[PDB]
Amino acid sequence: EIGGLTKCSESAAFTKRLNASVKKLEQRASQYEADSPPALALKQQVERTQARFDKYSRSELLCGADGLPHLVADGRWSHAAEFILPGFGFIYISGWIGWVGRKYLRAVSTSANPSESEIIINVPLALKIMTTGYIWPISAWQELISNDLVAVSEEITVSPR
Amino acid sequence: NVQVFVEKDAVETSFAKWAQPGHFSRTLAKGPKTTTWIWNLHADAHDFDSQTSSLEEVSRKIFSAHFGQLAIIFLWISGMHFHGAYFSNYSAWLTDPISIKQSSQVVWPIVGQEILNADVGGNFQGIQTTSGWFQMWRAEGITSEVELYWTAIGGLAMSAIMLFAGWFHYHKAAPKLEWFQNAESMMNHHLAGLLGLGCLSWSGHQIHIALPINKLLDAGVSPQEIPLPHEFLINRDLMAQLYPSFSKGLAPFFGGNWGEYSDFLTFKGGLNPVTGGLWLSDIAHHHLALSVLFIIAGHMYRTNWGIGHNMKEILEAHKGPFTGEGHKGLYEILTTSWHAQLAINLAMMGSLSIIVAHHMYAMPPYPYLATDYATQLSLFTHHMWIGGFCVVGGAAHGAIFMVRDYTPANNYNNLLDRVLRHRDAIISHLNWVCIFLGCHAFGFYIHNDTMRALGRPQDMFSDKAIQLQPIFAQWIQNIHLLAPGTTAPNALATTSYAFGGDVIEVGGKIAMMPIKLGTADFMVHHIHAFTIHVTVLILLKGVLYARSSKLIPDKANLGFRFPCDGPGRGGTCQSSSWDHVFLGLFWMYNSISVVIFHFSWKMQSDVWGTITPDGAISHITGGNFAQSSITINGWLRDFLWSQASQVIQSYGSASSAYGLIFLGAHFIWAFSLMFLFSGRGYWQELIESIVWAHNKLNFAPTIQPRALSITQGRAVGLAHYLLGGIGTTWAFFLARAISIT
Amino acid sequence: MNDFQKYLSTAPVLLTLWMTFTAGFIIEVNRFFPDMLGLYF
Amino acid sequence: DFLVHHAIALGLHVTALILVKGALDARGSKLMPDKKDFGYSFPCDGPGRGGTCDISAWDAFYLAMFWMLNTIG
Amino acid sequence: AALYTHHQYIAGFLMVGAFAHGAIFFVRDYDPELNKNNVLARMLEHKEAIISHLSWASLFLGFHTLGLYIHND
Amino acid sequence: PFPTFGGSTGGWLRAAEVEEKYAITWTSTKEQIFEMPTGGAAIMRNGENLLYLARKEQCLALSTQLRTFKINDYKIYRIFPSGEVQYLHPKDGVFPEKVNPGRTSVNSRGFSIGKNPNPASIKFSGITTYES
Amino acid sequence: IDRNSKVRILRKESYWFNQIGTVATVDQSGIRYPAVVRFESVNYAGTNTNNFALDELVEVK
Amino acid sequence: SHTVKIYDTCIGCTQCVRACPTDVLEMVPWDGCKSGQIASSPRVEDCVGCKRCETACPTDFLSVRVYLGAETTRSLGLAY
């Protein structure tokens, strides 16, 4: 397919890996009695291994010659579940964290003792501000348009050139 | 007059100061203006003498903090007992100590980490643990997990008691300084009470509980059939069945016919053939004799009854024609400086840990310890590291004494004064000794590598060539081998088989056999002498040049810990005694690393291994130490490269955590070099550009970011260096030893 | 109780609690939804 | 190849960062605004102002040599 | 193998040298008035943005490359 | 007029004989122990004391210590091998930290530190920017 | 420029260059740097006050 | 010998003079500041270059500057 790869549900090496992993787990399980907690734990590991291999098989994941899933991250939507959608989630979460941190720092910058509020967090203000993170991109846009996001150079210290 | 003086309600109990970080320091109390404040807060937290100028307050803080440490230690011991009681295969291991692998840690099934639950035997999966808990518990007479649960419960109770005692003796009943300055009474109590009564009571446990239980367990009795421990107390007939002299009772003890107790108080020496450990009857006799010795020692000093010695008098009398006033002033130093006492006590405790490591390998005290090669390696290595750190700390606190608590007026023409007066001679001669040792000891190896590379094996320093036999060590070994019949006539066997004798075999594995010393042992022992001498050079230079030097005449005014005195005079970086501790730590790491590598390779090559019933010995690494350890190439190939196989091939097995930790320790060790090789000017300049980017978006902390201080840069670099190197050796040793055990 | 709450509001205590909570929810998500090599389910 | 190439890019970027910061701060910085009066190579500016070890541009060269060696490795 | 390694190490040394001599030029030869408002001076004018963005790129590459290697391990 | 001192290995070397030596004198009002900068403790004499040292910095460290004894009359000299003496400290009979008329300013530049010329502007002149 | 005035710093070698401080006092005796300015943040030496000439300061509103 | 320069931002606080371990600096009369005195370095032949004077100076940027130069016995702090 892409890059001369093949679907893991069509890869002989992938299925060989599944069989090998299950066989080693069951060989370990064969040393105990059927009702021993080691045996039950090993058989649950076997089930989880089989479920994982099956989940990768039913997915769109592609596989190289080694029989391991490879990720496609050139921007195609047909593989968006591998980089694009997780990337969307990460950007959303990280922007939330950063926006609420910046907002809290700017809010306590005008308190009686700004430095004290950085080592001893005002928890009520922090929780209130953290709950506002979900609209961080809209807030960021409004801050950018209203000239509150970006400062002027004349107001920022620099060293002699 | 030895009296108890206590002030009541000394300090209020309140959470106010918990909300005022840095309250203990006048400067740090004003609050942070830069991130440096934060680091300073942790650095000065337990520096009590800088938080107050009253010695009584420092003593009170130290006493309560000691209680806190005791509470933590009890919590740790209680946790180990609880994990033995609920997450171990101790019961199964009791039935077959030889084939079942000891395990007292279990991991939860998450993200695949359950692979770490090894197939250790006994219908149990977990991590193979190497701290020796099962052997110790079996030696104590513990046969059930319920006994372990009760020991853990008591550990929790004692931890709470220590915590309350610390709170009580800081906040409710704080002793006066006059109470603390009771060296005579403290020595009397700690010798006679703590050490003497401790030994006597432990001997009581061993005689009454541990001895009969182990005699039964060795005889092949099942743990589920052995009588409960209190039955041995309430049934003198039960003991009379095992040790017949108990049928006479205590009549011989008070009659003086102590020979009657020869059946349970012995002097056998050697090892128990079934267990591979010391005879428990020898250990009981040992603890009883020690208890007597300590109780005697605890009546030497005068407290309240006229009789006894005054330490100051004894010290003052010991002076000669070479030493001026001699030991005068030492008593005042050791009763007014906590740093002087800590220097002595850290030096002693570290040296004792090293001694413990040696003695515990050569005379394995617990049953089935000797053939648990993983446990033996881990215990030796752990106690070596602890000892190295403690000796270096003793040096550091000696330097702190010199800077802060040394007064010229109280040390005129005494031993300390005269040492300071010939520091140049001392340091120059130690420097020369270090060069001589290093050149010769390491040049042996370099010469050998060059000769072997040039195809000239007959020109090497080796057994098969120019020989360097450790004849003095061999002479001592022969003397100790001949001791049992002649110079220790009542000993039935040698103190340790390492000196000579038969091979002690347990479950087909070698517990101990004679450790022969040749040219390779000569070379490695002189390497040890070299590394120790260099470490002493660095630390003694730090102590003797702590106050002053020809370079910086007023060092004491700069303090114990300062980065430098500027780039002048050619450059004065790392002239402080703290920097001498910093460099000595690297050298101690080098020394201990070599010592533990010597142990690992020598034991694998010449001691540990299998032994057929016929008598054929197969050592773990096939006796390659003698011809491979005499070159650096042999260490790189036959020790590191070869024995790293287990740690690097561990992926996909229960040992994979060791491969991961091996890699992570390499990573942290390399990460430390960024701090050690660089300087804070660069980092502060980079932080300026980063602060610019934050300011360009209208936000920046009022706690201004700062690169670490010079001294903190050094401290961080060294801490990560030690963590990385030691953790690498840790993973490597543990994977190797779990494979070979 | 105000002083104890202010101690709990200090930076290290709050970071320890917050990172423990975050680690806990990551662990639980991986306990109930393991082996997510991408959003495939 | 993908992962090793991103490692190589890390090495190139960090080596460049050290060298570029050394060149661009060679004349001065907030910590040492008059650095140009002291030359390209000088030990430090002493323990004052928090400490100034490895502040010169030569020191940036010295730090970047380690990163160049690591990257080429 | 020897030829590739030899030439790559020499290239690294040459690149480090190029930046060292750029820094030396800035200390010893650069005249702000002769270069007033030119591209060379404007590099100095936005050195903070340049260094901060190079730092961001380095941190991103390091975090994610090391993270992917460790996850795989 | 030497203080009571049993000697040490930290004292002066051949340089004191062939290059230069330093001497510090002072008046004490009682016998008191002090710390030798070269290592060890010595006993000041009641009256005048004289001490020889290898470096000026050692003499000044000792004088700083003497100040803690309330002793302010110490004088510091340099002695050359020929026997010529230089009176060094306090140079004019007044401590340098106390402003004194008749002293002339040395090495002042009449501008803030940020106004030194650019290096590229004085190339091949043999001068530095801080000296021009 | 007077006492309590807020000023922007024009001295390039200053830690507070381009930043805002408050004029505490201005000496009226003919000294070279008469205006004493306090800042809310410390420099690398831990100080938060400095003396300036009047052409090194700009009033801000 | 090292070079020690005093710039006119000096406020005559006398801290550099008290910090100097080798007595290089002294206070001299001057009408440029409120304190009526300025630092001076008449004895740079004895300067070791420790930069304690710079550490002590309260102005921003420094009013006393030590530039290290030609080394002598005195500037290297040699007892030999």
Ligand code: CLA
């Ligand atoms: C001696 C030290 C010690 C150590 C290193 C361990 C280690 C372990 N124990 Mg053991 N244990 C110990 C003592 C110890 N224990 C003691 C004394 C007891 C008796 C109470 C036990 C009883 C016990 C049981 C019953 C179990 C364990 C288990 C475990 C394992 C999982 C722990 C875990 O993840 O919990 C969860 C960890 C957390 C919830 C982390 C919370 C951290 C807090 C929030 C931060 C605290 C910081 C500070 C104090 C608070 C400041 C803020 C505050 C004021 C609000 C781990 C190997 C488990 C196990 O082995 O499973 C197979 C298990 O089931 N332990």
Ligand code: CLA
């Ligand atoms: C960070 C510090 C540290 C840690 C984590 C450990 C950890 C361990 N130690 Mg070690 N130990 C240390 C420092 C440390 N040690 C130091 C500094 C010394 C020198 C005194 C020792 C001497 C030592 C001995 C002799 C033994 C251990 C043992 C152990 C293991 C079992 C733990 C236990 O509860 O045994 C409990 C300890 C015992 C049952 C024996 C204690 C016998 C000693 C002689 C008691 C001394 C107490 C005395 C009052 C101390 C004062 C000394 C005096 C001169 C003033 C465990 C791996 C034991 C082991 O290896 O078991 C398999 C073991 O037998 N350690």
Ligand code: CLA
């Ligand atoms: C009996 C043991 C003992 C005691 C009571 C002390 C007590 C003290 N030491 Mg000493 N010291 C000791 C042993 C001891 N030391 C040893 C063994 C060494 C050699 C390493 C030293 C070397 C030393 C130096 C060089 C200095 C001191 C200093 C001090 C004082 C300040 C302590 C402080 O505030 O640190 C606060 C405690 C911390 C900041 C914790 C540090 C954490 C360490 C660095 C790493 C821990 C690693 C961890 C175990 C592993 C984590 C792994 C994981 C992350 C993967 C205090 C009086 C300082 C002083 O100024 O004295 C007046 C000082 O400069 N000590």
Ligand code: CLA
């Ligand atoms: C492997 C790297 C390495 C080497 C070779 C050295 C070597 C030395 N260190 Mg150093 N050290 C090191 C790492 C190293 N260190 C690191 C990483 C640190 C940072 C922690 C330090 C920090 C440090 C301190 C604080 C001190 C030392 C000291 C020493 C010297 C110890 C005295 C001695 O044995 O001289 C003998 C020389 C050798 C052992 C090297 C090789 C000897 C050869 C093989 C035999 C003789 C050959 C002969 C000269 C012929 C040469 C032929 C040639 C002309 C072609 C020795 C020169 C100490 C010192 O100077 O004490 C006097 C000292 O105090 N080092």
Ligand code: CLA
């Ligand atoms: C292998 C060792 C090592 C590592 C990992 C680093 C890492 C770094 N160097 Mg350093 N450096 C090193 C050796 C190393 N260096 C050496 C030997 C020197 C010569 C002195 C230098 C000299 C140097 C200079 C001059 C510069 C760097 C810079 C950097 C950063 C580059 C950007 C980056 O990759 O961010 C990614 C971060 C990492 C890869 C490190 C984080 C590691 C893990 C992933 C974090 C895990 C955190 C953990 C969860 C929390 C702790 C757990 C527990 C204790 C609580 C990075 C932090 C530059 C910089 O600052 O750029 C911004 C820079 O200018 N280094």
Ligand SMILES: CCCCCCCCCCCCCCCC(=O)OC[C@H](COP(=O)(O)OC[C@@H](O)CO)OC(=O)CCCCCCCCCCCCCCC
């Ligand atoms: C084998 C162990 C290490 C040996 C190292 C060197 C082997 C050389 C032989 C030296 C042993 C005898 C020393 C003199 C004999 C001795 O024991 O003391 C004899 C003598 C004691 O004099 P007094 O009779 O005045 O002593 C009164 C006492 O009460 C002390 O107050 O000490 C001196 O003359 C000065 C000691 C410094 C002498 C320096 C000699 C070189 C020392 C080497 C470094 C020692 C390393 C040990 C450090 C822990």
Ligand SMILES: CC1=C(C/C=C(\C)CCC[C@H](C)CCC[C@H](C)CCCC(C)C)C(=O)c2ccccc2C1=O
């Ligand atoms: C890298 C390095 C630095 C820079 C490193 C610094 C400033 C340490 C940064 C520590 C961080 C900020 C604390 C731990 C925080 C985590 C890394 C991230 C969490 C962020 C918030 C939750 C606080 C020095 O300052 C330094 C100084 C002297 C010699 C060598 C060096 C040195 O090598």
Ligand code: SF4
């Ligand atoms: S500032 Fe750094 S480089 Fe300069 S002398 Fe001090 S420790 Fe050395």
Ligand code: SF4
């Ligand atoms: S650098 Fe040191 S010796 Fe020189 S003038 Fe300054 S304080 Fe005095």
Ligand code: SF4
């Ligand atoms: S140079 Fe600095 S320290 Fe010296 S008097 Fe002037 S302002 Fe004070």
